[PDB]
């Protein structure tokens with residue numbers, strides 16, 4: 001329950017214990033409550049910005065008195081003398097006196113991992129623009145699963161930029177706001193089109209890594225070459241469940257990535273292939289064979305085992321039962337969460353031409369747009 | 379020295395030990411050497427991209443023979459029967475058997491931390507756009523020190539965008555391509571007021587965080603409004619040295635950040651105030667009193683200590699001896715590495731007018747421009 005019943009303050013005033021109507025208890029420290037006061041002199045009413053620093057809060061701050069009344073908690077602090085009230089709902093929702101999961105390599109509860117049994121989420125270009133429920137569902141699919149298709153879009157150059165603008169902002173690079181991906185498939189070219197088709201995340205040599213990628217089809221007359229996506233979190237999960245020490249090595253040591261092109265682009269980054277939050281949640285995958293650079297940061301005594309784990313992760317990524325495959329017809333596109341979901345394509349099986357456009361955008365904007373839609377539809 | 383004298387191979391063939399002319403030794407594994415082969419069947423001559431996957435290398439790859447010859451190491455791998463040569467200079471530069479520092483909270487070799495004892499580095503607008511040496515030095519100062527002033531620039535709206543274009547690309551956000559830093563009615567952010575701002579990094583509620591920020595002065599004629607920058611890495615170093623447990627609390631638990639300053643925007647992030655690499659190198663600082671959200675990820679029995687460490691970090695950041703203070707004149711600007719160097723301003727009021735412009739860019743582009751300038755020079 002989120003309905004407060006009563007409160008006791010410790011003799012020290014250093015914390016209080018809130019009891020709810022279902023019998024549950026939750027303890028809150030004086031300093032935390034003071035810092036999180038929601039009144040107009042702590043949080044600006046117009047923009048929600050906090051108006052005080054930690055330095056502004058007296059170091060000896062304590063709870064003087066407190067009371068539960070009519071679904072809310074009244075708290076008065078000393079030595080300031082400041083009285084504030086907290087809604088019951090807010091206290092329960094923002095509780096920290098709970099059992100924090102510490103499992104190393106766990107995923108956020110908001111994501112669902114997948115393999116080849118997962119259908120490609122698909123949404124309509126026009127519906128996502130006119131119906132906020134469709135837009136919400138489209139962005140929610142990218143949030144939960146890390147990818148989604150958009151179909152029935154226009155066969156127009158730069159349309160992918162319009163897609164990005166539906167939720168956020170394009171990460172412009174040296175290659176432009178977007179780049180052309182043109183392919184001529186014929187008997188002569190067929191050989192080299194088979195090279196470098198391992199699933200990968202783009203640009204692990206950029207820090208910060210571009211967090212979303214959009215690929216948009218304008219023309220396709222070549223047979224085969226289905227797009228493939230692989231869940232980096234599923235691959236990492238499989239490694240962890242099988243080989244926790246190997247998982248720990250890939251998460252516990254940075255790799256090196258580098259792109260040094262002939263057209264004056266030289267990009268480098270130092271980041272692990274599996275990135276965890278400091279409390280163990282899996283937050284990002286970086287995997288790209290073509291731009292992996294010399295691993296200079298891994299101690300000698302761990303290098304062999306690191307390489308073994310790296311190989312094993314690659315085997316999960318190369319596993320065909322991990323890939324979700326789909327065709328892209330003119331006007332169709334897909335987005336990947338480039339911090340999680342890898343992409344590639346299968347081999348071409350017939351001659352022809354293909355024209356895709358690619359760009360990057362950032363997840364923060366997508367989540368904001370999703371948050372706003374959820375509030376509007378709630 | 380990078381001159382190889384002799385080599386030995388382990389019984390298993392799993393690694394070799396290279397001895398250089400100065401007496402120093404460095405061990406290299408067979409698998410690592412094979413994966414890093416520099417030849418045209420492993421690395422493209424055109425762009426240096428890797429042509430193999432990890433799966434392409436035989437699992438039982440081992441050194442069959444290794445020899446040192448005029449400054450280089452020649453190695454043959456079984457079972458491929460592939461022979462490659464590694465220059466001594468390359469081996470020295472890319473060694474991993476170097477007893478790398480494992481000091482938790484250490485800074486990267488390239489960065490140099492600072493406090494108020496060092497005057498702000500300043501570069502000239504006209505020089506950096508015309509003279510490539512001056513551009514290199516300017517960008518390298520930002521890379522090393524996380525901060526540089528650019529002075530004698532034009533008093534022109536949008537000039538900061540031209541500045542960004544000198545080295546990289548603008549991170550456009552909800553705030554605009556660039557934003558107007560001036561007092562606004564119904565402000566969406568306390569930046570758009572006359573209030574003083576505690577030293578902070580921008581947008582800790584944004585993941586990915588903007589990695590660079592440009593602030594550019596058009597008018598600054600009101601009393602107050604001085605700029606201050608604080609090296610977040612120096613502040614973190616001080617906490618580390620004084621209070622290792624406090625440092626570990628701030629590095630080891632996520633904080634929460636949130637911005638909901640108007641309708642149509644709701645940004646949230648879950649990141650520690652001190653972000654370390656997996657091996658203990660400091661990567662980023664996130665510190666912002668105005669958009670720190672309720673800390674829900676810290677265990678009850680650690681919350682008081684966490685707040686004490688947060689307070690102490692704030693004390694280092696508020697320390698006048700840590701802040702480099704200056705008042706921008708029209709046409710002057712500065713850039714901060716927004717993952718590292720915090721910025722602040724004193725409040726302003728009275729007759730006179732203040733108008734700054736701000737925008738974000740990214741370090742990846744800056745480093746590329748710098749890398750290219752160094753190669754060309």
Ligand SMILES: O=C(O)CCC(=O)C(=O)O
Pocket residue numbers: 559569575580593604605721722723734736
């Ligand atoms: O007004 C200033 O000098 C700084 C304002 C600021 O912190 C910002 O716009 O990010």
Ligand SMILES: [Fe+2]
Pocket residue numbers: 200201202343
């Ligand atoms: Fe790609």
Ligand SMILES: [Fe+2]
Pocket residue numbers: 569578579580721
């Ligand atoms: Fe700021």
